[PDB]
Write an enzyme that holds these catalytic residues in place. Sequence first.
Site, PDB file in Angstrom:
ATOM      1  N   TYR A   1      -2.468  10.707   4.725  1.00  0.00           N
ATOM      2  CA  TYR A   1      -1.499  10.085   3.817  1.00  0.00           C
ATOM      3  C   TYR A   1      -1.202  10.931   2.580  1.00  0.00           C
ATOM      4  O   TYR A   1      -0.067  10.948   2.090  1.00  0.00           O
ATOM      5  CB  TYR A   1      -1.950   8.677   3.415  1.00  0.00           C
ATOM      6  CG  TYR A   1      -1.845   7.646   4.525  1.00  0.00           C
ATOM      7  CD1 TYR A   1      -0.749   7.644   5.382  1.00  0.00           C
ATOM      8  CD2 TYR A   1      -2.799   6.652   4.688  1.00  0.00           C
ATOM      9  CE1 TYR A   1      -0.623   6.707   6.395  1.00  0.00           C
ATOM     10  CE2 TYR A   1      -2.681   5.703   5.698  1.00  0.00           C
ATOM     11  CZ  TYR A   1      -1.591   5.739   6.552  1.00  0.00           C
ATOM     12  OH  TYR A   1      -1.453   4.803   7.556  1.00  0.00           O
TER      13      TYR A   1
ATOM     14  N   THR B   1      -0.951   1.131  12.663  1.00  0.00           N
ATOM     15  CA  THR B   1      -2.130   0.292  12.739  1.00  0.00           C
ATOM     16  C   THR B   1      -1.810  -1.104  13.240  1.00  0.00           C
ATOM     17  O   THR B   1      -2.732  -1.923  13.353  1.00  0.00           O
ATOM     18  CB  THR B   1      -2.859   0.224  11.384  1.00  0.00           C
ATOM     19  OG1 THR B   1      -1.911   0.092  10.313  1.00  0.00           O
ATOM     20  CG2 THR B   1      -3.727   1.470  11.180  1.00  0.00           C
TER      21      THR B   1
ATOM     22  N   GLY C   1       4.112  -3.201   7.162  1.00  0.00           N
ATOM     23  CA  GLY C   1       3.146  -4.121   6.589  1.00  0.00           C
ATOM     24  C   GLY C   1       3.713  -5.502   6.294  1.00  0.00           C
ATOM     25  O   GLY C   1       4.924  -5.729   6.270  1.00  0.00           O
TER      26      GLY C   1
ATOM     27  N   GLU D   1      27.817   9.274  -7.785  1.00  0.00           N
ATOM     28  CA  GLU D   1      29.031   9.900  -7.302  1.00  0.00           C
ATOM     29  C   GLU D   1      28.850  10.269  -5.834  1.00  0.00           C
ATOM     30  O   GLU D   1      29.800  10.181  -5.046  1.00  0.00           O
ATOM     31  CB  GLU D   1      29.331  11.129  -8.170  1.00  0.00           C
ATOM     32  CG  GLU D   1      30.755  11.650  -8.142  1.00  0.00           C
ATOM     33  CD  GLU D   1      30.969  12.773  -9.142  1.00  0.00           C
ATOM     34  OE1 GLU D   1      31.062  12.473 -10.356  1.00  0.00           O
ATOM     35  OE2 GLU D   1      31.065  13.948  -8.717  1.00  0.00           O
TER      36      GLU D   1
ATOM     37  N   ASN E   1       7.642   8.275   9.772  1.00  0.00           N
ATOM     38  CA  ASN E   1       6.320   8.901   9.722  1.00  0.00           C
ATOM     39  C   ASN E   1       6.109   9.958  10.807  1.00  0.00           C
ATOM     40  O   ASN E   1       5.362  10.922  10.585  1.00  0.00           O
ATOM     41  CB  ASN E   1       5.210   7.855   9.811  1.00  0.00           C
ATOM     42  CG  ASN E   1       4.729   7.382   8.447  1.00  0.00           C
ATOM     43  OD1 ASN E   1       5.021   7.995   7.423  1.00  0.00           O
ATOM     44  ND2 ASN E   1       3.931   6.325   8.438  1.00  0.00           N
TER      45      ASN E   1
ATOM     46  N   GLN F   1       0.812  -1.215   0.000  1.00  0.00           N
ATOM     47  CA  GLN F   1       0.000   0.000   0.000  1.00  0.00           C
ATOM     48  C   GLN F   1       0.850   1.272   0.000  1.00  0.00           C
ATOM     49  O   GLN F   1       0.698   2.143  -0.869  1.00  0.00           O
ATOM     50  CB  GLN F   1      -0.926   0.006   1.212  1.00  0.00           C
ATOM     51  CG  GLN F   1      -1.795   1.246   1.272  1.00  0.00           C
ATOM     52  CD  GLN F   1      -2.795   1.211   2.402  1.00  0.00           C
ATOM     53  OE1 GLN F   1      -2.825   2.116   3.237  1.00  0.00           O
ATOM     54  NE2 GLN F   1      -3.624   0.170   2.439  1.00  0.00           N
TER      55      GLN F   1
ATOM     56  N   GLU G   1       4.321  -4.265  14.247  1.00  0.00           N
ATOM     57  CA  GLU G   1       5.239  -3.603  13.323  1.00  0.00           C
ATOM     58  C   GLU G   1       6.699  -3.710  13.749  1.00  0.00           C
ATOM     59  O   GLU G   1       7.558  -3.847  12.863  1.00  0.00           O
ATOM     60  CB  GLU G   1       4.810  -2.158  13.033  1.00  0.00           C
ATOM     61  CG  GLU G   1       3.552  -2.125  12.146  1.00  0.00           C
ATOM     62  CD  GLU G   1       3.182  -0.738  11.605  1.00  0.00           C
ATOM     63  OE1 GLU G   1       4.052  -0.066  11.030  1.00  0.00           O
ATOM     64  OE2 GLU G   1       2.012  -0.324  11.728  1.00  0.00           O
TER      65      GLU G   1
HETATM   66  N1  LIG Z   1       4.005   7.512   4.570  1.00  0.00           N
HETATM   67  C1  LIG Z   1       3.041   6.629   4.312  1.00  0.00           C
HETATM   68  N2  LIG Z   1       2.895   5.529   5.124  1.00  0.00           N
HETATM   69  C2  LIG Z   1       1.920   4.630   4.861  1.00  0.00           C
HETATM   70  C3  LIG Z   1       1.050   4.797   3.794  1.00  0.00           C
HETATM   71  N3  LIG Z   1       0.195   3.746   3.800  1.00  0.00           N
HETATM   72  C4  LIG Z   1       0.502   2.930   4.829  1.00  0.00           C
HETATM   73  N4  LIG Z   1       1.564   3.475   5.499  1.00  0.00           N
HETATM   74  C5  LIG Z   1       2.261   2.928   6.676  1.00  0.00           C
HETATM   75  O1  LIG Z   1       2.628   1.592   6.392  1.00  0.00           O
HETATM   76  C6  LIG Z   1       2.436   0.766   7.514  1.00  0.00           C
HETATM   77  C7  LIG Z   1       1.419  -0.299   7.138  1.00  0.00           C
HETATM   78  O2  LIG Z   1       1.882  -1.027   6.022  1.00  0.00           O
HETATM   79  P1  LIG Z   1       1.042  -1.172   4.649  1.00  0.00           P
HETATM   80  O3  LIG Z   1       1.801  -0.606   3.464  1.00  0.00           O
HETATM   81  O4  LIG Z   1      -0.306  -0.527   4.826  1.00  0.00           O
HETATM   82  O5  LIG Z   1       0.884  -2.779   4.573  1.00  0.00           O
HETATM   83  P2  LIG Z   1       1.082  -3.708   3.268  1.00  0.00           P
HETATM   84  O6  LIG Z   1       2.421  -3.588   2.608  1.00  0.00           O
HETATM   85  O7  LIG Z   1      -0.028  -3.426   2.280  1.00  0.00           O
HETATM   86  O8  LIG Z   1       1.011  -5.193   3.922  1.00  0.00           O
HETATM   87  P3  LIG Z   1      -0.365  -6.010   4.172  1.00  0.00           P
HETATM   88  O9  LIG Z   1      -1.570  -5.130   3.867  1.00  0.00           O
HETATM   89  O10 LIG Z   1      -0.348  -6.515   5.580  1.00  0.00           O
HETATM   90  O11 LIG Z   1      -0.396  -7.197   3.243  1.00  0.00           O
HETATM   91  C8  LIG Z   1       1.932   1.652   8.630  1.00  0.00           C
HETATM   92  O12 LIG Z   1       3.030   2.051   9.414  1.00  0.00           O
HETATM   93  C9  LIG Z   1       1.373   2.853   7.902  1.00  0.00           C
HETATM   94  O13 LIG Z   1       1.468   4.024   8.673  1.00  0.00           O
HETATM   95  C10 LIG Z   1       1.184   5.911   2.965  1.00  0.00           C
HETATM   96  O14 LIG Z   1       0.432   6.095   1.997  1.00  0.00           O
HETATM   97  N5  LIG Z   1       2.187   6.817   3.241  1.00  0.00           N
HETATM   98  N1  LIG Z   2     -10.722  -8.444  16.086  1.00  0.00           N
HETATM   99  C1  LIG Z   2     -11.808  -7.740  15.597  1.00  0.00           C
HETATM  100  N2  LIG Z   2     -11.732  -6.377  15.697  1.00  0.00           N
HETATM  101  C2  LIG Z   2     -12.824  -5.708  15.204  1.00  0.00           C
HETATM  102  N3  LIG Z   2     -12.818  -4.345  15.284  1.00  0.00           N
HETATM  103  C3  LIG Z   2     -11.828  -3.570  15.990  1.00  0.00           C
HETATM  104  C4  LIG Z   2     -10.739  -2.979  15.169  1.00  0.00           C
HETATM  105  C5  LIG Z   2     -10.954  -1.861  14.352  1.00  0.00           C
HETATM  106  C6  LIG Z   2      -9.953  -1.277  13.557  1.00  0.00           C
HETATM  107  C7  LIG Z   2      -8.711  -1.865  13.610  1.00  0.00           C
HETATM  108  C8  LIG Z   2      -8.475  -3.004  14.425  1.00  0.00           C
HETATM  109  C9  LIG Z   2      -9.460  -3.566  15.194  1.00  0.00           C
HETATM  110  O1  LIG Z   2      -7.164  -3.382  14.282  1.00  0.00           O
HETATM  111  C10 LIG Z   2      -6.544  -2.401  13.458  1.00  0.00           C
HETATM  112  O2  LIG Z   2      -7.563  -1.521  12.958  1.00  0.00           O
HETATM  113  C11 LIG Z   2     -13.924  -6.398  14.647  1.00  0.00           C
HETATM  114  C12 LIG Z   2     -13.897  -7.775  14.605  1.00  0.00           C
HETATM  115  C13 LIG Z   2     -14.995  -8.587  14.031  1.00  0.00           C
HETATM  116  C14 LIG Z   2     -15.345  -9.771  14.654  1.00  0.00           C
HETATM  117  C15 LIG Z   2     -16.365 -10.604  14.149  1.00  0.00           C
HETATM  118  C16 LIG Z   2     -17.063 -10.276  13.014  1.00  0.00           C
HETATM  119  C17 LIG Z   2     -16.712  -9.076  12.374  1.00  0.00           C
HETATM  120  N4  LIG Z   2     -17.234  -8.505  11.233  1.00  0.00           N
HETATM  121  C18 LIG Z   2     -16.584  -7.314  10.988  1.00  0.00           C
HETATM  122  C19 LIG Z   2     -15.630  -7.120  11.962  1.00  0.00           C
HETATM  123  C20 LIG Z   2     -15.688  -8.234  12.871  1.00  0.00           C
HETATM  124  N5  LIG Z   2     -12.839  -8.500  15.066  1.00  0.00           N
HETATM  125 MG   LIG Z   3      -2.241  -3.918   2.082  1.00  0.00          MG
END
Ligand SMILES: Nc1nc2c(ncn2[C@@H]2O[C@H](COP(=O)(O)OP(=O)(O)OP(=O)(O)O)[C@@H](O)[C@H]2O)c(=O)[nH]1
Ligand SMILES: Nc1nc(NCc2ccc3c(c2)OCO3)cc(-c2cccc3[nH]ccc23)n1
Ligand SMILES: [Mg+2]
EC number: 3.6.5.-
Lengths: 440, 420, 67
Positions: free
Chosen positions: A224, A179, A143, A254, A206, A11, A183
């Site tokens: 972002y 998130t 990520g 260089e 960041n 991402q 990490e």
């Molecule tokens: N600077 C910057 N950081 C980002 C951006 N998007 C995600 N991040 C950072 O990247 C980390 C999360 O990794 P992602 O790139 O979202 O994860 P991914 O590579 O897609 O890996 P998965 O989704 O788990 O398969 C977090 O620390 C975010 O703050 C962006 O657009 N800009």
């Molecule tokens: N573990 C977990 N967390 C949930 N929400 C909290 C949360 C929000 C944002 C986050 C995060 C966690 O982690 C990073 O960003 C929902 C659920 C769930 C369970 C069962 C059925 C479900 N249908 C949709 C959702 C869900 N399960």
């Molecule tokens: Mg991703």
Amino acid sequence: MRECISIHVGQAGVQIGNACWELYCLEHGIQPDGQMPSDKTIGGGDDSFNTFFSETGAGKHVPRAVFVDLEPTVIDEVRTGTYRQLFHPEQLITGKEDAANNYARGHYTIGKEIIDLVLDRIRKLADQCTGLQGFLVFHSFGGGTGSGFTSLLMERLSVDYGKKSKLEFSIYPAPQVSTAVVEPYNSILTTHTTLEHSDCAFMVDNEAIYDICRRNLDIERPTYTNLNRLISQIVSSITASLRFDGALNVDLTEFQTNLVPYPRIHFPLATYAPVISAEKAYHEQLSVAEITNACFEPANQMVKCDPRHGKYMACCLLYRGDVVPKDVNAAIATIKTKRSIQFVDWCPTGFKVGINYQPPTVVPGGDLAKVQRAVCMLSNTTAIAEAWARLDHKFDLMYAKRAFVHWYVGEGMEEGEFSEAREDMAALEKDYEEVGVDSV
Amino acid sequence: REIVHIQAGQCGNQIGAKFWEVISDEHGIDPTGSYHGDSDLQLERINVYYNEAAGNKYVPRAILVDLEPGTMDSVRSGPFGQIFRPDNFVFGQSGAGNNWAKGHYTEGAELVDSVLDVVRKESESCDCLQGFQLTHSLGGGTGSGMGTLLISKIREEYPDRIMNTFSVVPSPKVSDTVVEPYNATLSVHQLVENTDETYCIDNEALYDICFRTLKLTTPTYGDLNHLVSATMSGVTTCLRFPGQLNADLRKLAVNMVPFPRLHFFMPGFAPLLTVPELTQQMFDAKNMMAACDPRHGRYLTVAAVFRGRMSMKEVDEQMLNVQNKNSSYFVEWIPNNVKTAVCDIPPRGLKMSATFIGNSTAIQELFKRISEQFTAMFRRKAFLHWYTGEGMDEMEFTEAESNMNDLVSEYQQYQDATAD
Amino acid sequence: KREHEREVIQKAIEENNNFIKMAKEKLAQKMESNKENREAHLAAMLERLQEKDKHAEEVRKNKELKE
Ligand SMILES: Nc1nc2c(ncn2[C@@H]2O[C@H](COP(=O)(O)OP(=O)(O)OP(=O)(O)O)[C@@H](O)[C@H]2O)c(=O)[nH]1
Ligand SMILES: Nc1nc(NCc2ccc3c(c2)OCO3)cc(-c2cccc3[nH]ccc23)n1
Ligand SMILES: [Mg+2]
Ligand SMILES: Nc1nc2c(ncn2[C@@H]2O[C@H](COP(=O)(O)OP(=O)(O)OP(=O)(O)O)[C@@H](O)[C@H]2O)c(=O)[nH]1
Ligand SMILES: [Ca+2]
Ligand SMILES: [Mg+2]
């Protein structure tokens, strides 16, 4: 020739890619359909911008770039967005199910299913080059895909292209927009596995970018989009020497010679100025001196650390726009008489300077002012090791309890990989200590 | 992408129906399955829970199970009863009579295969199934025993998919049926091994909320289920509307579960305003849907979900304030363990609301309570012949008790751990 | 001097090839070991569930032979 290939992973890598290619199009006068009316050599050429863009017989200018993600929604936005016509469809590659913030899924379970296709599309790009220079790789540390798949890819590239240079742009995690709890695990695993395969890596913290957006652009809660536009300005400063010609222009390779004294010590600190809003730029023209001074203010750094409590091993200044050497020399003289700049005793203290005349650009509707002159400093300082320390401490706290480790073991990893990686980071911190001691 | 939903037994089917009513209302789907909303945000991730049929009809991806027929009738006559696929109703005739062994080993085993056939047909046509959610109670016969059987069989066929439950824990204040602690201990024994995530919805807490706070002198099942449906809507909000966040059930699980057995969550809801007031109230013991004081333990992990239009700056500042002022209640060895989501779309009838999901070691208080009632009967072997008559040994009861005591001890171990 | 020049260029070729070789063998060892570990994890899970189905059969065969 001397072409470069860009690879955008996950991402963060993809979205930063979007910001960078948009900005490059504006700098070179390329429209979203790919046409470039100023380019009179149809279907080819060896202009400086051809290092980054190839040309079709129909006049289209096509990025030398691959985008890769394990789920489709981010790259689907590129497929339907403003710049959908810039890219050939074979350049945009997606799987169905992501790595769920888990290094092990990106390196093994899911990553193994798509690596060969990605390598073959890269091969297709490489075959169009008459003198390929190397790779630029964009990814997050945190990520699952940005950590684990990038590791896998770097290993395979070393196999297929030997010692061909590979540079990284790496997004270092911060809690304000982070998130995931895991990490720190992913950050150490990828840093260990990539260390021997990368020639040079530019880390972007960041938290530093967030702070700068709040303090200097008066944005209450940066998105972002804000962060990526600023990052893209720094990337553009670094690649401008590859993309424009000129007599005072200085090649990045260089600078790499000067930035890297030992293979493991390859992590430069970047500082950029000026970052200013339109309301404040009005009736306030910033001189060469003001921006050069701002390069030694820690609040403008891309990584949080204190260069005043370490030692310099190299210091480079990349100017762009309305800048002549006389003003550079006067500013440098002043800074040398006023600031805490201590070099190691085995290294000379001269600053290396480059000037590109093509002025800076901004994106329409942005929060940055258009300015007449800008500067990026790249320094090799021991203080950057503070960022490793912060990450290692968080790693230790969790690993002592084995928290979350079962998620990695369930995908086939062993605990031995955790402790081997952590030891390699310990030895890196020790290296950074050893290089700052005086000779005898 | 796709989630498959299962509801088993009387309790499971009643709360399932309420869940489908509330979310169908949030997405602008009428009882015939047609979209008549006012905003493209309603359909962008609709397929997570709804299939598209011919005529742009939307049909819940939902399977309805009981050993007792007639709950099927009450669902079918309910307001949204025509929306369900008719072939997705799988009901026996016998009943289970509040006997877990009937649900798990005898009557339920006969029907489980016909349930699995419907599960398989729904799963085969998913573009990319993420996993399953089950609604049931732990105190009866069908939902507890047959539901945990279904869980085990699903894991055999989809070992790499996520399994999530919303599990209603019994209380003497709502049911006087005397064998309930046996059924709950036997089900918990299964859950520790075969689910990734369990929301503990405690009838004790729901009763006390309806009585003290909402001032309902004689709470009915309808009042308890209103709270349950508001909670479940809250906790699926982050998957259901487009919005900063790019996740799937596995990434949420990876963020919330530090040890595989410790996956039993404490839900909360507020109000029963300003951002500081919401924030203070959602962390108050009185707003929890499990009868536990979080100040008697420590948080391993927390998720907070805010709904409505509000300042994101202010939300960030208040979450940091609560962490700073309540730092002793968060374990020091998991940094950055509190996650926050904001959805612009409020629930029906509120301008602002908050849903809370906690992984707290204070959940041991719930397990202790049930454990006490279990032992009170097991020491006199009361009513045991109901179960041995179905082929069960005493030994299985001994083992289930032992496992729940182990779970308690493990929660205590991580509550006492330090960093230095 | 000419012979020394030939030894320098041959040493450079040799080191590049040795780096490629060692990275290829390290990767292959890791990608095999990971596959074996994951498959063993899944096989233990399935085996535990089959032992559960066996116990359920012995229970129903207990209840029948009670009557
Ligand atoms: N600077 C910057 N950081 C980002 C951006 N998007 C995600 N991040 C950072 O990247 C980390 C999360 O990794 P992602 O790139 O979202 O994860 P991914 O590579 O897609 O890996 P998965 O989704 O788990 O398969 C977090 O620390 C975010 O703050 C962006 O657009 N800009
Ligand atoms: N573990 C977990 N967390 C949930 N929400 C909290 C949360 C929000 C944002 C986050 C995060 C966690 O982690 C990073 O960003 C929902 C659920 C769930 C369970 C069962 C059925 C479900 N249908 C949709 C959702 C869900 N399960
Ligand atoms: Mg991703
Ligand atoms: N919160 C809530 N609890 C309920 C509801 N309906 C039943 N219960 C609880 O469910 C428990 C009994 O389990 P049931 O759902 O009736 O058992 P079952 O799955 O239908 O199995 P059998 O009736 O034996 O066929 C009791 O402790 C009730 O308090 C409901 O609508 N809401
Ligand atoms: Ca040309
Ligand atoms: Mg019933």
